[PDB]
Design a protein around this ligand. Structure first.
Ligand SMILES: *[C@@H]1O[C@H](CO)[C@@H](O[C@@H]2O[C@H](CO)[C@@H](O[C@@H]3O[C@H](CO[C@H]4O[C@H](CO)[C@@H](O)[C@H](O)[C@@H]4O)[C@@H](O)[C@H](O[C@H]4O[C@H](CO)[C@@H](O)[C@H](O)[C@@H]4O)[C@@H]3O)[C@H](O)[C@H]2NC(C)=O)[C@H](O)[C@H]1NC(C)=O
Ligand SMILES: *[C@@H]1O[C@H](CO)[C@@H](O[C@@H]2O[C@H](CO)[C@@H](O[C@@H]3O[C@H](CO[C@H]4O[C@H](CO)[C@@H](O)[C@H](O)[C@@H]4O)[C@@H](O)[C@H](O[C@H]4O[C@H](CO)[C@@H](O)[C@H](O)[C@@H]4O)[C@@H]3O)[C@H](O)[C@H]2NC(C)=O)[C@H](O)[C@H]1NC(C)=O
Ligand SMILES: *[C@@H]1O[C@H](CO)[C@@H](O[C@@H]2O[C@H](CO)[C@@H](O[C@@H]3O[C@H](CO[C@H]4O[C@H](CO)[C@@H](O)[C@H](O)[C@@H]4O)[C@@H](O)[C@H](O[C@H]4O[C@H](CO)[C@@H](O)[C@H](O)[C@@H]4O)[C@@H]3O)[C@H](O)[C@H]2NC(C)=O)[C@H](O)[C@H]1NC(C)=O
Ligand SMILES: CC1(C)CN(C(=O)[C@@]23C[C@H]4C[C@@](C)(C2)C[C@](c2ccccc2)(C4)C3)CC[C@@H]1N
Ligand SMILES: CC1(C)CN(C(=O)[C@@]23C[C@H]4C[C@@](C)(C2)C[C@](c2ccccc2)(C4)C3)CC[C@@H]1N
Ligand SMILES: CC1(C)CN(C(=O)[C@@]23C[C@H]4C[C@@](C)(C2)C[C@](c2ccccc2)(C4)C3)CC[C@@H]1N
Ligand SMILES: *[C@@H]1O[C@H](CO)[C@@H](O)[C@H](O)[C@H]1NC(C)=O
Ligand SMILES: *[C@@H]1O[C@H](CO)[C@@H](O)[C@H](O)[C@H]1NC(C)=O
Ligand SMILES: *[C@@H]1O[C@H](CO)[C@@H](O)[C@H](O)[C@H]1NC(C)=O
Ligand SMILES: *[C@@H]1O[C@H](CO)[C@@H](O)[C@H](O)[C@H]1NC(C)=O
Ligand SMILES: *[C@@H]1O[C@H](CO)[C@@H](O)[C@H](O)[C@H]1NC(C)=O
Ligand SMILES: *[C@@H]1O[C@H](CO)[C@@H](O)[C@H](O)[C@H]1NC(C)=O
Ligand SMILES: *[C@@H]1O[C@H](CO)[C@@H](O)[C@H](O)[C@H]1NC(C)=O
Ligand SMILES: *[C@@H]1O[C@H](CO)[C@@H](O)[C@H](O)[C@H]1NC(C)=O
Ligand SMILES: *[C@@H]1O[C@H](CO)[C@@H](O)[C@H](O)[C@H]1NC(C)=O
Ligand SMILES: *[C@@H]1O[C@H](CO)[C@@H](O)[C@H](O)[C@H]1NC(C)=O
Ligand SMILES: *[C@@H]1O[C@H](CO)[C@@H](O)[C@H](O)[C@H]1NC(C)=O
Ligand SMILES: *[C@@H]1O[C@H](CO)[C@@H](O)[C@H](O)[C@H]1NC(C)=O
Lengths: 239, 117, 117, 239, 117, 239
């Protein structure tokens, strides 16, 4: 049975079908609500290298979709444009009526290549990809999503700002994936898990204002010298 | 049982988005031609961790996943919209699926004001 | 409230089309291979304005639009088929969603033939 | 809450959720019915110039569809084939399972061009486009529909003849739209709101029988000298 | 009525396949990424003709066809998933759609343990 | 009303809506089940020539699909790849989410040509085509299905081996259809209704082991000299 959340004795609990409590009153379907909650709130690493490692390609499993009515504003979201080395798309186009997650402070747009040895991209930990009031078991191409899970429960009777951080990837979905933070189309910064979104934004801003962008036609890549808290509380060097 | 939060962390605050329940729009905002675009149909709210609800919710959702996934494996429906309605039907069948034995433990009939008559 | 017709006009007669409720077909007309085409599956009827129902319906539909539209804005379902079933579930939850207090105003239990016993 | 119609005291009323009346008996789902009613019955102008002015193009609003079980025979229906000046279709193809309105005495088929500054065509007054037991918020290409609204209610416990009237349009969806009633592929009559369907039919018949059709290879257009009741109760001149 | 088997033959044994009702998987088999493919999500069973059920089922299904087909002709839904839920709602409306008259034939309320009080 | 099966007095019966029996307890939706039962179990002929004659092409009837939760292992299944003489496909591609019947001992794959004077293939006896937990009124191209019917009821409170038998057809869907059992791409056996699946398998095996296959580049066809029970209880000659 799918668990159902109910407030008993000033605390949330999972209601057991093998127990009829006449005190609970379900007077209308308005009391029933489905809720989507982001993995961000459980403390999972949200950097692109860590987040991507939780997804993987698989075949033989039909995709599935379930709706939810309310969601949580997300600090980190992801948007994937992955192709095979021969240029064929690695992810399916978003089905009709599936839009991106409606509230993202940072959208990590990742573009690159990988083997993609599987018909669909699934969450290796069983979580869901959260879209606009629809949660899917698989990733859709170029569609913003958040990692999350769904709960069902019985109720008792500043503005929005979004910023897009762009990445380039090679070997997507393997244990030798490489990531670059994109400053412009010819300037890139080597990326690791330590890099927070605001840190990347300030890196980009100082690179722009300090002229460290590529003033040539070639690709310029920056590696940075060093130079565990949750958010709610031609190569060269930069030291 | 009771919900035990076993996550490494818990954001105690919940900045949530949803859609309004009806909410008769001001003037002509209800017409789709004049109404808001898909991006501007959301209401927002902030909920704190009173009664520890937020953290509990985070555990509840986690604990739901397995069961939900198994359900989605068994269904041939591409998009499932009926879980809550099925649960309401099950709520009604639990209480009124059979004959109600007054004063019984599985019958939600109270002859109190009828007792004092 | 009561339905007040505020339209410029009202066709008092209602020439309606619909589909038959079952209606065991003559012989083999029920097999899709032999049955009628999509265009010939309709029954027709004529209804006059007794009790002023027709005109009222025309107002009712008009008055429904706003609410309906708002509902359709909030749903992610491309095609909605569940409004009437949800309304039936709400009808049952209104009466039997909680314990029934005999002789109470929100309990539809009549102990009349039990009173004379 | 979506209003629900119920018959009380020999009159239809909207039932209030904040009122439990035990007298009403809902013994089966067969008592619940959804109904589609045409704007025609409320007295709206049904001529093509008037009807088209109630529709308009808009973007950013996903289309929505809701079913209804019973409908009303329509005097006037509409079927649109609109393209941009560059030939791209202005309306989307009918989705699978959406057929035209099943009962139309006159189908006004309009073909022409317009800017179509919007991804979908909506009803400016919030009404619905009625198809075969499906009501949509947007117009589908080449699919017959009627303007209408939907009601929901609780029940208490000659032949069919259709005629197609063809029009040509320019500047569709603007305040300078021009319409021509088509007699044949080379004979057209300037159109205004005053023209009723039967009047157009008799114009066509007399033009055919009087030889006023184009006996040349060019386009011949007729303007007519003059020469408020509801239905249920190379240019040249014609005077 | 009662089901009369009018078929030329009847396989009295029923080798059936279906999907498990939840069935908490061993370890991580519930995750779609690790779970079985579409072909390996089925459980199997064998049922014999006790109480003549199997044969009856075969007739029942046959007898259902007509009605089912007519239903599918009247619906605009491309894929129908709601027959059983509608039947459950009808089950509840049959018993509790109106006021319950205690001791009446259409009221499923038993005041037996209340009678001995 | 759609009949509903219920167990009363140690026997299955069809419940009448015009009869309220308070003894029956429906405590949850888990008690309600939809079931698919194969025509095989009613004794119908399952040979390809007999089975195909029960299907026919028709236009003007929209296809319909209904789900079922449990099914019966089938001895015989069918998989059709039919084209018109001009090479256009005769059957529609399987819609998204419709997979073949999950349990078939023998899959009769038929490839050939016919007039196909109809938009869809329906069952002439009103039965259903059973797919993976979905029953359709029409046949989908290249998708394995079984002939069957659906029942609805209220519950009271070795391994899997599949073999594919390939056929070639001409004049599919007419009264002059011709069928060939395929041994290899150049060896064929004339087919009639008398041929059971195991008989065809042993014919193929003995043809292979006896060298009776075509040792040339041409097509070799075998007609067999003769040489009513249910399963659960360049031409030349072969005599
Ligand atoms: C509901 O909430 C619970 C609790 O938060 C979540 O539990 C997590 O479950 C996943 C797997 O389902 C766990 O991930 C696995 O960890 C194993 C050991 O952990 C390593 O990492 C931790 C740091 O987190 C170290 O302390 C430890 O020493 C280990 O080094 C790994 O062995 C597993 O490896 C598998 O995947 C990798 C990655 O591809 C492969 O290389 C391996 O071959 C192997 O297949 C795996 O990574 C995770 O640790 C659990 N977290 C906690 C806190 O317990 C649930 O996932 C959550 N449910 C949903 C649906 O979200
Ligand atoms: C349910 O039933 C009611 C009552 O029948 C319908 O009400 C109509 O609502 C629409 C708008 O929603 C009204 O249309 C608007 O009329 C305004 C004034 O009316 C002009 O026309 C009337 C003649 O009908 C004159 O008497 C009057 O003096 C005005 O000249 C207009 O100002 C509005 O203009 C808007 O649209 C135009 C057209 O593009 C633009 O050019 C403008 O800039 C502006 O945006 C508008 O046209 C209509 O009058 C109402 N009718 C009645 C009888 O009250 C509901 O629509 C109906 N609900 C549904 C869902 O169908
Ligand atoms: C539920 O269960 C019942 C009983 O098992 C099934 O009943 C069958 O219904 C079909 C038609 O719906 C019957 O088929 C028809 O048979 C007629 C006469 O039968 C001939 O064949 C029998 C041998 O079975 C001979 O004994 C007899 O003398 C006849 O020669 C035919 O005349 C019909 O012909 C039509 O189709 C053919 C084929 O294309 C055309 O050439 C004709 O012009 C004509 O249109 C037809 O074939 C069948 O006999 C019934 N069986 C039984 C045992 O009664 C139901 O079908 C089943 N329901 C579902 C949904 O499966
Ligand atoms: C938004 C509403 C109009 C509808 N409801 C609701 O969706 C929440 C309102 C709050 C309390 C809920 C119990 C119910 C959970 C809640 C939620 C949303 C997203 C993630 C997690 C939780 C927040 C949705 C109730 C009343 C509210 N005013
Ligand atoms: C067609 C039926 C078989 C089913 N019902 C119905 O659909 C209507 C029968 C009439 C009375 C209704 C209250 C119910 C409204 C009605 C309707 C149809 C279209 C537009 C407006 C109204 C007309 C449908 C009832 C019984 C009828 N004989
Ligand atoms: C498979 C289950 C987990 C769920 N049920 C069920 O589907 C059947 C279990 C058996 C008895 C049923 C009455 C119900 C009919 C049955 C069936 C399946 C296919 C064709 C015909 C009949 C067989 C499905 C019940 C409990 C079972 N253990
Ligand atoms: C990645 O996994 C493959 C799997 O065979 C292994 O050969 C390889 O050494 C691994 N590399 C890393 C970086 O762990
Ligand atoms: C960067 O490259 C992308 C991809 O080729 C291109 O669409 C975009 O216009 C480029 N931006 C600039 C500023 O050149
Ligand atoms: C990088 O900095 C420039 C200059 O301030 C700004 O225009 C640009 O949007 C920044 N890029 C990102 C991804 O923040
Ligand atoms: C010019 O190019 C050099 C080398 O790429 C770079 O370090 C510098 O930031 C660029 N801008 C200048 C010199 O203003
Ligand atoms: C149509 O509307 C446009 C909007 O700017 C206006 O410029 C123009 O004059 C209008 N024409 C008519 C015929 O009203
Ligand atoms: C009229 O023109 C249309 C569009 O080109 C064409 O399909 C049709 O056949 C023509 N009719 C006649 C009678 O020429
Ligand atoms: C116009 O009149 C001719 C001759 O009677 C007829 O054949 C044709 O169908 C008419 N056209 C319309 C649109 O009524
Ligand atoms: C011949 O052509 C003229 C001019 O187009 C037109 O008025 C007339 O009706 C046509 N038919 C005749 C002359 O019979
Ligand atoms: C097949 O049916 C057609 C229908 O006209 C008939 O002409 C023909 O003789 C029939 N052939 C056989 C083999 O029955
Ligand atoms: C037989 O023919 C089919 C269709 O041309 C082809 O796909 C297949 O590979 C062939 N098999 C052999 C063994 O040649
Ligand atoms: C026919 O026999 C050969 C040889 O035993 C075998 O490889 C092949 O699979 C058989 N074909 C069929 C359709 O059984
Ligand atoms: C050789 O060809 C002949 C004629 O097609 C055939 O009968 C025989 O089985 C084949 N194999 C041999 C001769 O070994």
């Amino acid at each position: 049975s799918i668990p159902l959340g109910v407030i008993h004795n000033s605390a949330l609990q999972v209601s057991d079908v093998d127990k009829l409590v006449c005190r609970d009153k379900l007077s209308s379907t308005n009391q029933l609500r489905s809720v989507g909650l982001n993995l961000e709130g459980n403390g999972v690493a949200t950097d692109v290298p860590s987040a991507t490692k939780r997804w993987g390609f698989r075949s033989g499993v039909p995709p599935k979709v379930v709706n939810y009515e309310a969601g949580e504003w997300a600090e980190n979201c992801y948007n994937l444009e992955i192709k095979k080395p021969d240029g064929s798309e690695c992810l399916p186009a978003a089905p009709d009526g599936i839009r991106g997650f409606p509230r993202c402070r940072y959208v990590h747009k990742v573009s690159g290549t990988g083997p993609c040895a599987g018909d669909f991209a699934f969450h290796k930990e069983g979580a869901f990809f959260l879209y606009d009031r629809l949660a899917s078991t698989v990733i859709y191409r170029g569609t913003t999503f958040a990692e999350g899970v769904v709960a069902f429960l019985i109720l008792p009777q500043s503005g929005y700002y979004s910023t897009t951080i762009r990445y380039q990837a090679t070997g997507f979905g393997t244990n030798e994936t490489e990531y670059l933070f994109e400053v412009d189309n010819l300037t890139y910064v080597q990326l690791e898990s330590r890099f927070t979104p605001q840190f990347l934004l300030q890196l980009n801003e100082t690179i722009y204002t300090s002229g460290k962008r590529s003033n040539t036609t070639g690709k310029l890549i920056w590696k940075v010298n060093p130079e565990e808290w949750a958010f709610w509380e031609x190569x060269x060097x930069x030291x | 049982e009771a919900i035990v939060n076993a996550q490494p962390k818990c954001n105690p605050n919940l900045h949530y988005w949803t859609t309004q329940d009806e909410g008769a729009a001001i003037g002509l905002a209800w017409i789709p031609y004049f109404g808001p675009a898909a991006e501007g149909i959301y209401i927002e709210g902030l909920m704190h961790n009173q009664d520890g609800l937020i953290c509990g919710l985070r555990q509840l959702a986690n604990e739901t996943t397995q069961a939900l996934q198994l359900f989605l494996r068994a269904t041939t429906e591409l998009r499932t919209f009926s879980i809550l309605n099925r649960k309401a039907i099950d709520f009604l069948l639990q209480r009124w699926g059979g004959t109600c034995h007054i004063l019984g433990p599985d019958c939600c009939i109270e002859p109190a004001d009828w007792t004092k008559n």
